[PDB]
Amino acid sequence: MKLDIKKTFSNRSDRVKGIDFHPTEPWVLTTLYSGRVEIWNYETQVEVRSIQVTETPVRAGKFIARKNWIIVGSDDFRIRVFNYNTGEKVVDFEAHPDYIRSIAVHPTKPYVLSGSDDLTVKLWNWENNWALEQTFEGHEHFVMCVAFNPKDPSTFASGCLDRTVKVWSLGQSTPNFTLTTGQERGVNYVDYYPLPDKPYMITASDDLTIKIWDYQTKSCVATLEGHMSNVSFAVFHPTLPIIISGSEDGTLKIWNSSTYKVEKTLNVGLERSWCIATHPTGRKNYIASGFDNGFTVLSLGVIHNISSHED
Structure with missing residues (x-):
């Protein structure tokens, strides 16, 4: 209901394009516009590893903690996987002949999805030598974001500058459905509400709007306005009744996920916002x-009756 937001750690660096939390260590992975990637322990404020991977932007990066890996994608067209304990480069392959915008990791099968400016999503299987298993075609502009449905990870969503979201089934060449968003400057980000109580998705656009979608009715539930520049992302928090967005206006906004009204605007002093992560287990609501x-x-911290000053 009411939240006390605390700053755990801030680190100044080159522009952070991708970010991810480790599920069992208090680490964040950051992928930078300079071609460097870094892992930081945010509780001790100590850098655990850094790598100059390339001299092009690294726009996408995720942990694959069950393999002790990070996986990163860069504008030089390549996907690289590193063991974060040894530093070994496990694989290095051309994934797309254009910029890689987004990487998603399947929660229980050895699958990774990549979305690209080449108009496609690709599925890679690390238990079959990182083979290209399937290319999902149908989008008509840059694929900006890919995300598995955490409630049914046999399906996933792609968000695209062609103004659509497509939801797909692994193994099938045509989408289960296509959502026409009416966000006329395209979709930069797509995410799922993670719990069973809402059949919802969310998109963010350069047209300054965030939109909530019902995947059963294929309808727009709500439109959230307030950002003054391109919206880079918007996500449902996995446990708290809020949406979190970030923008080239330099702010994060927190919105009520029931009424869709803004609640807070945070300016953390680091200029434009590009990417978001939420802790996989909700640890400390990080x-x-x-x-x-x-x-x-x-x-994030919920404020209880003793300190909420409701009386």
Whole structure:
């Protein structure tokens, strides 16, 4: 209901394009516009590893903690996987002949999805030598974001500058459905509400709007306005009744996920916001965002009756 937002750690660096939390260690992975990737322990404030991977932007990065890996994608067209304990480069392959925008990791099968400016999503299988298993075609502009449905990870969503979201089934060449968003400058980000109580998705656009979608009715539930520049992302928090968005206006916004009204605007002083992560297990309700001048990790904390000053 009412939240106390605390700044756990902020680190100034080059522009953070991708970010991810490790599920069991208090670490965040950041992928930078300079071609560097970094892992930081945000509780001790100590850098655990850094790698100059390339001299092009690294826009996408995720942990594959069950394999002790990070996986990153860069504008030089390549996907690279590193063991974060040894530093070994496990694989290095051309994934797409254009920029890689987004990487998603399946929760229980050895699958990774990549979305690209080449108009496609690709599925890679690490238990079959990182083979290209399937290319999902049908989008008509840059594929900006890919995300598995955490409630049914045999399906996933792609968001695209062609103004659509497509939801797909692994193994099938045509989408289960296509959502025409009416966000006329395209979709930069798509995410799922993670719990069973709502059949919802969410998109963010350069047209300054965030939209909530019902995948049963294929309808727009709500439109959230307030950002003054391109909206880079918007996500449902996995446990708290809020949506979190970030924008080239330099702010994070927190919105009520029931009424869709804004609640807070946070300016953490790092210029434009590009990316978001939420802790996989909800530990301390940690969230993290990457910006032009670095990243911040925040803890969310619910305010109970003793301190909420309701009387």
